[PDB]
Amino acid sequence: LDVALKRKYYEEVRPELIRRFGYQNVWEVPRLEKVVINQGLGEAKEDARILEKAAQELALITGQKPAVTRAKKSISNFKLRKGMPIGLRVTLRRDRMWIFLEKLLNVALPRIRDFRGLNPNSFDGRGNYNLGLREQLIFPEITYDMVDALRGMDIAVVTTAETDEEARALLELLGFPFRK
Amino acid sequence: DVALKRKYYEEVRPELIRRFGYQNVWEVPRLEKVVINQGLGEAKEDARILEKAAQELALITGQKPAVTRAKKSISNFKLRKGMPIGLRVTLRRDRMWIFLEKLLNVALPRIRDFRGLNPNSFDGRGNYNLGLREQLIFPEITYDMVDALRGMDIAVVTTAETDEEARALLELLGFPFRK
RNA sequence: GGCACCUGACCCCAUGCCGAACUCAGAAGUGCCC
RNA sequence: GGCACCUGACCCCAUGCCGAACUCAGAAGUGCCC
Ligand SMILES: [K+]
Ligand SMILES: [K+]
Ligand SMILES: [Mg+2]
Ligand SMILES: [Mg+2]
Ligand SMILES: [Mg+2]
Ligand SMILES: [Mg+2]
């Protein structure tokens, strides 16, 4: 399972984190835990062929089956208000996560005109990074293009770091193209 | 009574931060769960003493024990695939606190000649294990139902990354370590 | 409003045991998107 | 041999997605019961 971004973590990223913060044992060094990708529908468009087009492209770029999230309790009862399926969700762990981040950061994000870098301030206060991408994402597989149809998918990079400063060191050194 | 929790949140967390210098209160080690594993005594090869034993541990811990059995993978001589080898309960949150309080404010004191706890029983990742062989230390275990169960292997799992931090946690909580 | 984090379980629902997980909850907690 | 930790997985089994959980696996890994 020779993955490019994984290889970089143990080879480069891990040894330098143990320097910046000097961790006692190798198991306290922050790691990547999961990547949750959420492509919402926002009820702005209801066509059924939307959920299925998104469900299938999201599955190719992630290599995993998306789960259909749904509206729990009801809302405004006029007639045309709450559907049922409200978006797609996939949780990437292990190898599929290393492969998705390598394609996202190194081939998809760069092949975008309107891109200067990621906002280094989008950290949740507990070591996790939150991103929102409403552009076209070009992947080796297919092209994720629901720019006009749906809004932006919500990516959450959840790590084992305890603080944001250690979360971005991991991410900075990992490859994430920020602006700081 | 959840008095051991108050102690953690009022005394221990601040004393640990002082000792190790945690910048954030959520990095301070805490108890995640306690797993109890009871071997079988007379409840073994039976289904009436095994019910009085389960309800036995069920009252000691506050929750429904789980029955551990021998993996199902028979060869060619079909004679079943493993019967019950014991009971298991995973204590988290309040039930975990209440059990740790009883354990040291009731169960450990009822032991005669008690030395202390081995300060070495740390698994290397910040967790602690101990075995309470002979009972009569738990008020609940009724008479005429004592040898229904053997001794319990306890595993105190914490969020502490090392034994050092884990030990400080336990010692500040009030575990009577031999040392 | 949604996903992630955080925290809980009154409610649907859930645990070979465990609201750990799954489910649910949360204007006046944190991040991001609309 | 059991539980916990750790690491791993189409072998039974499993995930609204996810070997995260559940299941299973690991003499020559750590801890307590042996
Ligand atoms: K929770
Ligand atoms: K595991
Ligand atoms: Mg984190
Ligand atoms: Mg630990
Ligand atoms: Mg459920
Ligand atoms: Mg299963």
Helices B163-173 and B13-20: crossing angle, nearest 10°?
140
Which residue from B86, B141, B130, B76 is spatially nearest to B108, judged by alpha carbons?
A: B130
Report in angstroms the alpha-carbon separations of A55 from A68, A87, A145, B163.
Answer: 8, 9, 12, 46
Supply the CATH classification number for the domain B1-179. Answer: 3.30.1440.10
Asked if A126 and B162 come within 8 Å (Cβ–Cβ), the reply is: no
Deposited experimental method: X-ray
C-alpha A75/C-alpha A72 separation (Å) is 9
Quick one: how far is CA B104 from the chain centroid?
A: 11
Q: Architecture of A1-180 per CATH?
A: 2-Layer Sandwich (3.30)
CB A140 within 8 A of CB A100: no
At A16, list the tokens: 């330098």
Residues in CB range of B122: below 8 A, 6 or more apart: B128, B163, B166, B167
C-alpha A120/C-alpha A122 separation (Å) is 6
At B46, list the tokens: 């039976």
Residue A47 contacts B where some CB pair is shorter than 8 Å: no
Pairing assessment for the beta strands A32-40 and A153-159 based on DSSP bridges: antiparallel
C-alpha A27/C-alpha B124 separation (Å) is 11
At A50, list the tokens: 């939307």
* B150/D24 CA-to-C1' distance in Å: 28
Residue B27 contacts A where some CB pair is shorter than 8 Å: yes
Half-sphere exposure of A137 (CA within 13 A, CB side): 25
C-alpha A84/C-alpha A78 separation (Å) is 15
CB A168 within 8 A of CB A123: yes
The alpha carbon dihedral of B145, B150, B151, B155 has a sign of negative
Residue A105, helix vs strand vs coil: helix
Which DSSP string do the residues of chain B spell out, in sequence order?
--HHHHHIIIIIHHHHHHHH--SSTTSS--EEEEEEEEEESSSSS-SSHHHHHHHHHHHHHSS--EEEE------SS-S-S--EEEEEEEE-HHHHHHHHHHIIIIITTTSSS---B-TT-B-SSS-EEEEE-S-S-STTS-SS-STTEEEEEEEEEES-SSHHHHHHHHHHHT--B--
Q: Would you tell me how many other CB atoms lie within 10 Å of the CB of residue B131?
A: 13
In degrees, rounded to 5, the angle at the alpha carbon of residue B145 between the alpha carbons of residues B140 and B151 is 75
CB A70 within 8 A of CB A51: no
C-alpha A132/C-alpha A135 separation (Å) is 9
- Give the DSSP H or E segment for A137: strand A137-138
| Domain chopping of chain B, boundaries | 1-179
C-alpha B11/C-alpha A40 separation (Å) is 45
* Radius of gyration in angstroms for the set of CA atoms belonging to chain B, rounded to a whole number: 18
At B170, list the tokens: 């336990």
Which residue from B101, B129, B105, B131 is spatially nearest to B39, judged by alpha carbons?
A: B131
Residues facing strand C, Cβ within 7 A: A 36, 38, 40, 42, 44, 69, 71-73, 86-87, 89, 91, 119, 121-126, 128, 130-132, 134, 151-152, 154, 156, 158; B 26, 33, 63-69, 88-93
Please name the amino acid found at residue A139. F
Chain C nucleotides with an atom closer than 7 Å to a protein C-beta? 1-7, 16-20, 23-25, 30-34
Which DSSP string do the residues of A26-78 spell out, in sequence order?
GGGS--EEEEEEEEE-TTT---HHHHHHHHHHHHHHHTSPPEEEE--S----S
CB B122 within 8 A of CB B166: yes
Helices B93-102 and B49-61: crossing angle, nearest 10°?
100
Q: Which residue has the tokens 């945690």?
A: B22
Residue nearest to nucleotide C17 (CA to C1'): B66
At B65, list the tokens: 């024990």
C-alpha A73/C-alpha B66 separation (Å) is 35
Which residue from A61, A18, A21 is spatially nearest to A39, judged by alpha carbons?
A: A61
CA of A14 to the centre of ligand 2 (A): 22
The b-or-e profile of A79-98 (16+ CB within 10 A means b, else e) is: eeeeeeebbbbbbbeeebbb
Residue A162 contacts B where some CB pair is shorter than 8 Å: yes
Quick one: how far is CA B171 from the chain centroid?
A: 16
In degrees, rounded to 5, the angle at the alpha carbon of residue B122 between the alpha carbons of residues B117 and B125 is 155
In degrees, rounded to 5, the angle at the alpha carbon of residue B145 between the alpha carbons of residues B87 and B101 is 60
What resolution in angstroms, rounded to 1 decimal?
A: 2.5
Q: Would you tell me how many other CB atoms lie within 10 Å of the CB of residue B110?
A: 12
C-alpha A177/C-alpha A101 separation (Å) is 12
Residues in CB range of B118: below 8 A, 6 or more apart: B130, B177, B178
